[PDB]
Subunit: 206 residues, 2 copies
Amino acid sequence: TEAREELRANGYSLLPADRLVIDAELRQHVKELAAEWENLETDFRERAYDRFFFVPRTGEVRLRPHRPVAPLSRTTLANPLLTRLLRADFENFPVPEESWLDDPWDVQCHQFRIISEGPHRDEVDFGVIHLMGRFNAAGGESQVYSLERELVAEFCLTEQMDTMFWSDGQILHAVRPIHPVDPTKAAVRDVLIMGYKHEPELRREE
Amino acid sequence: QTEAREELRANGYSLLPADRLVIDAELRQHVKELAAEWENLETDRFRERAYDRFFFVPRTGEVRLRPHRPYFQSMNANDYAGGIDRDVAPLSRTTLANPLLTRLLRADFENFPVPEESWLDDPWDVQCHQFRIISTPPEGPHRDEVDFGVIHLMGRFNAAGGESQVYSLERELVAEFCLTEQMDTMFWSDGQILHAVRPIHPVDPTKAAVRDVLIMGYKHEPELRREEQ
Ligand SMILES: O=C(O)CCC(=O)C(=O)O
Ligand SMILES: O=C(O)CCC(=O)C(=O)O
Ligand SMILES: [Fe+3]
Ligand SMILES: [Fe+3]
Ligand SMILES: [Fe+3]
């Protein structure tokens, strides 16, 4: 399938919301999940964070104990779209060995709000970003670089649920800063990002 | 089974995807016969069901089909004898004749951390539920009031959602997983966790979403005596 092929070749794939089918339920689960971004703690950047124990074969997901950033809100974690996104996102990743589908994975779930970088990697095996909202913001392009620190592509997530897949060990990435269009109002860019790292020796935590 | 036992002791549940099983021709066939039974449950959003209780002695492998207590008897007595308090039809004759049913009932039990070795010589009541969930174009966290549980996914049709939730005894969400393939399996210790399943919704919204599960609940019953069969 498309998304899996592209990360094998290029190291990244795009999936704009236009090409997604958004029913009324999913509509309202996005509306509720996206409303959470109004309620992140500072340290301008407002954020929330948690990690998940994940096994793709069974779809098992476990909220790992919170180790710092503020934890994801109770309503966020209650929203079925969080872990449905988590599971669905993962299918778009070219895993090198089917066996890894049966090993544990650490999945970092980041709620970021930016209020108005060089090429790096997020130190995971695969990542995903979903644009939750954009308000009075110019710039903020997503950038794919090579391991040679040479820009190979640049694009802009603009619509809610716009999504980008990437193989964090193949490319380097960054996002240009955002600045307000109306100089009197602030720029706000609401992003949901998850980093997936294969961890065969991770254990369940009680 | 050893891993499943410790997993039940630590976490209160254990997962066994069908991929981790070796289904030969004979077994694969009995599975298909068993799953097809779900196409013939009684019509009373939509929930079709059948049910029976089995007398079970783990040491000898003895399974006896307990008589189906009529609903009019339970209701008018205000005494459901441990069983469910609903009006449900019996398991079909071709469900009971399928050897996979007896096999599952015996084999599933070997995944439970039985606290006392003497318990293997006592009778156990084993409730057997065939559930078909239909969503045409939810219950909260609970226990089943048994010692141990097992759920086998028989079928999933046009179904999204339907995630199984494991909750702590303080009603806190601790785990969540997806039975997706036929015979995907989940064992749990029913006094150690709470559980629930999310609703299904249709993928193609013009057609119904359908989810078929076999559920068994094992309750240690040392006073239970044999009944006629
Ligand atoms: O905002 C983006 O496009 C990605 C942000 C990112 O990579 C990070 O915050 O680590
Ligand atoms: O169908 C499931 O996953 C479990 C449903 C359940 O808990 C029940 O029907 O008692
Ligand atoms: Fe990054
Ligand atoms: Fe239950
Ligand atoms: Fe599965």
